[PDB]
């Protein structure tokens, strides 16, 4: 099996987008990675001080990257990293057997872990989805295990049973959590995996869990860091020392800078609309180049584009102050 | 081009499920159809009168069938019903460039259209569920297409907006649609595609809409026909003869049978766990042999499945009575 | 026991809002009741040919008008219809007993029956909605009784086996329900209640269900009367006719004229400004004048009023169409 | 104006339920409050410690009493608190001015302020939520208010826009919250009202709120005080203290005891039936005495009733503990 435990997920989990090449959004566009700014971006998420590297969750266009496409980005982002931080090769699919079966390749593309969602043409229970990540972990021993709890995508929120079942799963080392967002599961959830999992909020409720529970919430995971990662490690060193005072200022300062992500503030919209709103906060921070979405997620009311840009630029500027 | 048009499409449009062995909830199956009885289905199929064949939507597993079950599945069907009545292979993948790829190798195996969803990892807007159907026939204009309006499934009802555009797309010369499930939006999807697209009710409410609107609405799709298509086929010919008052008796009939499906009539609940419950009801019915649902499918209240056999017998009487 | 049965209610139910003096917007005014306008109203439905009249539903404001107020309306209403016509009263409160209390009391003002929604603090389960209404039915057995299946307004959709018990309620005889835009349901209603109990549809699609079940539904509800009952009056002629043909053609035409009632087509977004939109409608049809809406229900999107202006001048054609 | 200001909202705000009668469940019971254990409950909180008293929410079935019944509850509470804590009168109606009417009345029979819900026929706006408490503010100033946050209730949730709004009311001087329930919209609210209104979460999840923001949480509202209130005057001691890990051990054991209110753990099949539910956990604790709930939320599944007494036994427990 795995060494990484629970132990080895502290600090900030990064995830990246996948770069894209400027024809990304055509159907007729063979292979769409620009495999150059993945390799420069996965090593500037290392020397930023990113703890834990994980690819293609729903941002990261795992539903929209051929398998070619992926496996490829997963070999030159783990070739990039060359073991300095743990990796997690995102790998989700429609069903038990291609996901086991991606894994076990990513895994043999040198990969330390799996960031794995779940199918979703029709939801699991929690039954199922305990069945799900048994399943996938017994067919690859050898792959720490970072479960997706992303109820939009994936048609549920991860029961807290569940959690207490998958908290036996030697493999499951953490799971991306929706922190305040899912209100007070995030508790429930943190009591049910008693220290055997860590649950990972967002940057921006990061302080709130730690200084409640500083001894489990040691990590958080941030989708932003592609916008430059300096805000996200200053706040896990002001965390380490418990500079409260400062943690709750740059807390302030992260969502502020985020403010104009959601349209109207309406978060079930934005999720709409992750992937092409997410594209654009990317492309306007600067600190990565990259070019469209691919096909099918190219639509998006144009309004809610200029949220994302807004928010690249304001989070420019935190990373521009705390680098 | 196709050479298939709207005018192809009249009487039963059965779908069948993916006949499975007994092994076919493990995930470490590596093959999990069973062949024999996919070719005998697909011919009793053509003997019993259905007027076209689909496969591979949400109670044939599409989800969860391999690539490779996938292709052998389809070109035993093609090969049984050797081009008798036209075959619709179900494609439907995360994104729009793997379900182009498996739509030409489908129809390089002879399926002479392909009975396609959408990708669901985020919702498509009406803007991006035209652009996906459109991408899809430019690139495969060999065949044609059904379009499968799920709503539950692919996370929204198609837009009535979307329907006119679908409509002057020359190779979509069907929709699969959820008829007085969502009874506004036939009617007005109904005028959208004004004659061009055949919109296909359920065969519980077939008559309502064909007696209505006697020159469009002349055809059905039916789930049941693996369970025995005599009931359907009658049901065409009764409304063929316009025997209204035949047709209401029958109508009746067939709701009542199927009255235990939903359960405690939750439709919603039902389409939490539908490839389950369908699975329970194809294997009760009789009309053909099957094993258990492929993962991640497995897990439903035992209850859920009570209703899915009751149905099957239900529905196997009508199928020695009409047949 | 009431002297009216289901064989009572044919035709068209027409509802009327509650004509309103210009300064009703405003909470200090404690009367805000045009009680000329009600009875010039009330006598030009009769005069126009509706079969039966019902006051205070949702866009009536039930919920806005104070106790005195609504005596007063209905007791006008009642003078002026003096007789002709059979006048349900709308009386929908937060609990039982008062709903009771003012049921009694309306009808000692005359009314020939209650129009009853049911209380929606929390909402009620089919035995919670059966017992509320058998509750009413045994302290009012004098008054029949149109049950208001709105499911948007009393937070759910009144299930079939409700509709069982309902229909051996000898008051209740009739239920203002949604039609197609509850497509399914309206026909396991209708068989639930098998003819002791008819089932309104809207004017909208009642010549769909009237041609399908020419026994059962024969009357619709129509909240557009207040702008002129002529295009609905010869609907029910056209349907009595069995002139299909012109029943189509005069179905298109309702909703052509109705087509900018929905704010960018969204049917939900309409229902969360219904009463401030209907009441656009009725004064920009000229068939009656009325002022603002009551507090407090008084903020709304211009741009909606206006949809629902355009949708009162497209009326009034119609109307002086076939007046 | 009032002269009470958020500065008096502090420590336990205990909301009672009505006491009823053994005939309370039946609609031919005229009067069904019992006024004795009324007026030893209020007094038994006072003693108990709680801070600040309220009647007539969601569980104290301010939907199904009479009008007298709420004078009548509301003057007996007043005179048996005789002024020791401020008391705010739960007044919610369907519509401004029945509630401005009821509310001037409140405050002549001696309550010191208006615990206020909002019209819920049609939902409303932040515009509409605005202007509606404005205009309570304003025609009965003397009263201070308390906002009800129900989102099930009324029909969505408070937006933060309208906390801005609401906080510059002066009369508005608390909100009922949600607190983790509603996860993020609790600390956007807070930011919204700038320590102008006092943001009530639940005693469940108060001391994690008041370690985070101390200056800011200094109360909670808890509808458990009618079981027994020495559990939550002894959290806000122990918060007080900044005893946090006796605030941890303390809220665990309360929501131990509260566990089996919810069927099954589905905390939406609570609220279906939680003044039923609520009501059994008020019987089985033993610290009040009070009869069936009023019509018409009197149908209920026996086991939820099983879960409520359970529930209240378990606190009874604490209750003996901490008294």
Redesign the interface.
């Known amino acids: 099996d795995t060494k990484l435990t629970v132990d080895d997920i502290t600090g900030v989990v990064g995830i990246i987008p996948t770069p894209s090449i400027p024809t990304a959004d055509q ?2 566009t063979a292979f769409s990675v620009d495999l150059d700014e993945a390799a420069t971006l996965a090593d500037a998420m290392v020397r930023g001080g990113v703890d834990v590297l994980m690819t293609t969750g ?1 941002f990261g266009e ?5 398998w070619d496409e992926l496996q490829s980005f997963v070999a030159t982002v783990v070739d990039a990293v060359a073991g300095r931080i743990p990796v997690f090769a995102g790998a989700t ?6 996901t ?1 079966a991606r894994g076990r390749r990513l895994g043999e593309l040198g990969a330390d872990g799996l960031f794995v969602g ?8 929690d ?2 989805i305990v ?2 990540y048994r ?1 996938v972990a017994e ?1 690859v021993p050898n792959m720490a295990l970072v479960v997706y709890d992303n109820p939009g ?1 994936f048609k549920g929120k991860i ?3 569940a959690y207490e079942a998958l908290s036996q799963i030697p493999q499951v080392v953490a799971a991306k959590h929706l ?6 599961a995030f ?1 429930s959830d943190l009591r049910a995996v008693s220290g055997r999992v860590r649950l990972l909020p967002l940057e921006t ?1 990061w302080y ?1 869990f730690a ?2 529970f500083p001894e489990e919430v040691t990590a958080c995971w941030s989708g932003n860091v592609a916008c430059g990662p300096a805000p996200v490690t200053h706040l896990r060193d002001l965390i380490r020392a418990r500079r409260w005072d400062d943690c709750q200022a740059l807390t302030d300062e992260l969502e502020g800078a985020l403010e104009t992500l959601y349209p109207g ?1 309406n978060f079930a919209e934005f ?5 092409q709103i997410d594209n654009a906060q990317f492309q306007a921070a600067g600190f990565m180049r990259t070019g469209p979405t ?6 998006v009311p144009e309004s809610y584009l200029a949220g994302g840009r807004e928010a690249g630029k304001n989070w420019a500027a935190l990373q521009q102050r705390y680098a």
Chains 1, 2, 3, 4 share one sequence.
Not at 93 to 98: A, H, I, S
Not at 118 to 125: I, S, T, V, Y
Not at 271 to 275: Q, R, V
């Open positions: 159907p007729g729903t795992c539903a929209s990257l051929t699919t429609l069903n038990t057997r291609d086991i779940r199918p979703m043409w029709l939801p699991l229970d039954a199922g069945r799900f399943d067919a995508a029961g807290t049973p922190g305040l967002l899912s209100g007070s508790l409720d709130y200084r409640l503030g999720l709409k609309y992750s992937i691919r096909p099918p997620y190219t639509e």
